[PDB]
Amino acid sequence: DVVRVHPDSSLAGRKGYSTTEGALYSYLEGTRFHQTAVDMAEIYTMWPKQTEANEQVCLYALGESIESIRQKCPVDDADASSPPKTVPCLCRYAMTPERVTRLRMNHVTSIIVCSSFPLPKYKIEGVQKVKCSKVM
Amino acid sequence: DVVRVHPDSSLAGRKGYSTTEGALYSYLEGTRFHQTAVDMAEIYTMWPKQTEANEQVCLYALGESIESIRQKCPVDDADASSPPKTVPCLCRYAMTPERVTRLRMNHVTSIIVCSSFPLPKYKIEGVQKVKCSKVM
Amino acid sequence: DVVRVHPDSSLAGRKGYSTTEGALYSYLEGTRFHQTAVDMAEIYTMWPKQTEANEQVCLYALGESIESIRQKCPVDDADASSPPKTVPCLCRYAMTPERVTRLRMNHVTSIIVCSSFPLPKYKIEGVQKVKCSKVM
Amino acid sequence: DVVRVHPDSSLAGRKGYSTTEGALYSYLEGTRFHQTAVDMAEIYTMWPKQTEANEQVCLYALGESIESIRQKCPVDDADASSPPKTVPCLCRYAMTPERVTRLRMNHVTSIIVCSSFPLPKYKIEGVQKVKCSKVM
Amino acid sequence: DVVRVHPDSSLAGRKGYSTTEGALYSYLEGTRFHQTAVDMAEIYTMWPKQTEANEQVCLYALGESIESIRQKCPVDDADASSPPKTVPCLCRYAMTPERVTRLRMNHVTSIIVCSSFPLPKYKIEGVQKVKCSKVM
Amino acid sequence: DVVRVHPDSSLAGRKGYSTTEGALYSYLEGTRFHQTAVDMAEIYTMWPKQTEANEQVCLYALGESIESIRQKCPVDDADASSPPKTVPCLCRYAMTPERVTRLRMNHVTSIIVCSSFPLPKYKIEGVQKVKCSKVM
Ligand SMILES: [Zn+2]
Ligand SMILES: [Zn+2]
Ligand SMILES: [Zn+2]
Ligand SMILES: [Zn+2]
Ligand SMILES: [Zn+2]
Ligand SMILES: [Zn+2]
Secondary structure, eight states: OEEOOOOTTTTEEEEEESSSBBBSSSSOOOOOOHHHHHHHHHHHHOOHHHHHHHHHHHHHTTOOOOOHHHHHHOOOOOBBOOBBBOBSSSTTTTTOHHHHHHHHHTOOOOOOOOOOOOOOOSOOOTTTBOOOSSBO | OOOOTTTTOOTTTTTTSSSSBBBBBOTTTTTTTHHHHHHHHHHHHHSSHHHHHHHHHHHTTOOOOOHHHHHHHHSSOOOBOOBBBSSSSSSTOOOOHHHHHHHHHHHOOOEEEEETTTTOOOTTEEEOOOOSBOOO | OEEEEOOOOTTSSSSSEEESSSSSBOOTTTTTHHHHHHHHHHHHHHSHHHHHHHHHHHHHTTTHHHHHHHHHHHSOOOOOOOOBOOSSSTTTTTTHHHHHHHHHHOSSEEEEOOOOOOOSSSSTTTTBBBOSSOOO | OOOEETTTTTTTSSSESSSSSBBOOOTTSSSSSHHHHHHHHHHHSSSSSSHHHHHHHHHHTTTTHHHHHHHSSOOOOOOOBBBBBBBBSSSTTOOOOHHHHHHHTTOOEEEEEOOTSSOOSSSTTTTEEOSSSSSS | EEEOTTOOTTTTTTTTEEEEBSSSBOOOOOOHHHHHHHHHHHHHSOOHHHHHHHHHHHHHHHTOOOOOOOOHHSSSOOOOOOBBSSSSSSSSSOOOOOHHHHHHTTTTTTEEEOSSSSOOSSSOOOEEEEEEEOOO | OEEOOTOOOOOSSTTEEEEEBBBBBBTTTSSSSSHHHHHHHHHHHOOSHHHHHHHHHHHHHHOOOHHHHHHHOSSSOOOOOOOOBSSSSSSSOOOOHHHHHHHHHHTOOOOEETTTOOOOSOOTTTEEEEEOBBBB
């Protein structure tokens, strides 16, 4: 089965990845983003509600270690992680595991997050919220 | 999709930008004005009503930092920012993100703002209000 | 009788092993994984409930000696070991005796375990829990 | 193929260069002006319309670095550069790559530009516009 | 069979190489450029689309190690490499394996690339895009 | 019966060996490559599928002992070995027993393997995959 990827994904036009069809959730096995993917997946289990889970994902993109993310979880409950969305949205600010990997490699001090990535209504340092131009 | 720009815009006659048709709202991705654009967009969220939002935008054009603009917001609520108007009007005083970028680069101590950019009825230092010659 | 093996098993396409049919439980006689298999089988007897038995199996995969595993058993009761599942699931993280053998040979410091391998709800060092893509 | 050069060019009467015939566009390979040529070519791509491209070329002749010229471009689009005109006109003020090289070497604070080099209708510091005595 | 080479190639006028006829693809066995050739070929497999493959080739010419190029590939898929074009074009900026070898030997900090070598529309450090004077 | 050998084989033009006709499979009795041949044959029995058998052959060419190759086999089943192909292909990278013998004598740290020698789609250390110029 082919894994659906973002149109701007570097996996586009590759064997096992497609832009117009495929699986919408994946750990991206066989790529480097795989690691980031599973880390993001673990985050989405540590915080069941999407808002503060996305806040922790944004902090992860800003270079914060995943170990501190595990530390910040209120409980020690550990459940199996579901694969993160490979295409959360279709704009250039989609918080895919690939984009998070790229931001962590670039060590960016600020990121731009679209509205398809719901965040806490209060300010987050290094995160700028913009409208999602086009959604999934 | 092409992004509609001002007739006096430096993006006129370029790939992805047009004067007679295109998107009327954009963060101007791929340009420098992009940064100014998103900043202006954030301002338009900090002040929901257009009058004092435009006052803050005018102060932004006069060189005041965006950090102080965030400080001046009465609340800490942060919602996703909608793209600013690329063509608020068709005169030479259109408060486009490009014009704001140019004014900030020139470090102007006074600006001229047309009537298509609604402002508070009281005086604003460094801002002169004139009639908009032609509107959108 | 043919022994059913994982699709990613190195025993696939060999005499006595098959992917689409065969025995679902085996000590894998005639292979090296045999040893690991019987060790895993012994673990599954030392801990009757699958959760902490799988925890001990995960620790076994992380390089911990089987002698310490025997030491950690609360009782000295020793009953005959049933053959471990050759195909616990169909994803790439199936905790087959072959996969455990490969992980022990590679001396990995961290493993990824799918949801078809039930584990304790608390954190286990060196183990990352992910959803099983496809099950048996 | 011979490259057509200006009658006042120092490449006149040389192998591969001619005054009465030859290629009207060239990067001037094998000369020093080559570098200036390609820089001018890049300018002509950064600004698609000839007017502000010629303004940037005039600023380049006045000693301004090409890096700042790249900075001043509104977009980051980079397309292949076409060779600049070796003979834009036949007067002594022809803005050939050779003339630009000579002006940059002399570090002139003011230049005279003929009417065959279309410029913005507003004043440019250090540039004096005169009629082109004879054109191509 | 003779291998067609660039008119400016140092292999011109040699046994097994010709300018007017021959094979248009080769690993250049028997030469030093052979190594560069196969490296370039591997690059063209790592990035299936010609644009970012040519970007990686340009970075290779700028002295970046091939090991880092392998690292930068999003996937670990490795398919057989097709021989690179010995004559991608007929101008002096043809990105032949010989030219890449010469540039790597000279340790150049900047290269000039013609339009027959398609590159990403954004800026690449140390690469200047010019029109290809004559094509294949 | 004559044994068909590679055109670049040192057995070419010898009694019992020919380039245009002969047996396509042989243990190469009477030569030194004989030993390598039978070793390769044994490898082709240890791994029934050609892909990982060729991977093990490539590792054998890189100097790894045949005893470790026997150790790496998942099973202890030992069936009679069929003679390896004396001419797997007609290019210079043909993985003949003679070429493997030469590479082992030279103790090469890297080899180039054509596409007629199918290998695993993942990277193999010391092996570079290129297109086979001409096949059998
Ligand atoms: Zn979005
Ligand atoms: Zn107006
Ligand atoms: Zn599973
Ligand atoms: Zn003139
Ligand atoms: Zn060219
Ligand atoms: Zn071959």
